Amino acid sequence: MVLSEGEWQLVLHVWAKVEADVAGHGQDILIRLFKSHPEILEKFDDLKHLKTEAEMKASEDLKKHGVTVLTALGAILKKKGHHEAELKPLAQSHATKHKIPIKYLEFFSEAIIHVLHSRHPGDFGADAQGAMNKALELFRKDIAAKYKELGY
């Protein structure tokens, strides 16, 4: 699958709203993800004790993890599908060290999309919704293949 330049433009236009407050979006996305999927919280040894929303918002460690994922994903999206080099070390760490099943990445994509609908609807209309679905599907397809390429 291959996105048009117009689709990438819609993706990166709403992504620019995320990067206006990366830490705040990271908190929102991760808190949504951890509440929807408590099994994912269990994968973070430094976070897995967290329970309340106030506790999650107070955690400097959670905030750092939100910045790390959104910064890496932003760099990948700006490759507009030419992301082989970026996906290799991510597959290695997430498959073999963090032990993240591939389906968890779909739950992360769902949390991104939920936060974009809530925060930035004026930049997330019908066309941009479709384009973001496609960009995250392409990311998931390609990283799932990288998981397999490493034997996981």
Ligand code: HEM
């Ligand atoms: C449900 C989805 C995911 C889970 C559960 C997960 C889990 C983790 C964990 C446990 C760590 C190690 C944290 C630490 O102890 O310092 C980590 C690191 C990291 N994650 Fe994720 N991750 C997910 C998705 C992603 C995605 C989609 C990206 C980028 C597009 C990403 C980028 C990173 C980066 C850059 C690091 C630091 C370096 C590395 O270990 O590769 N993560 N992740």
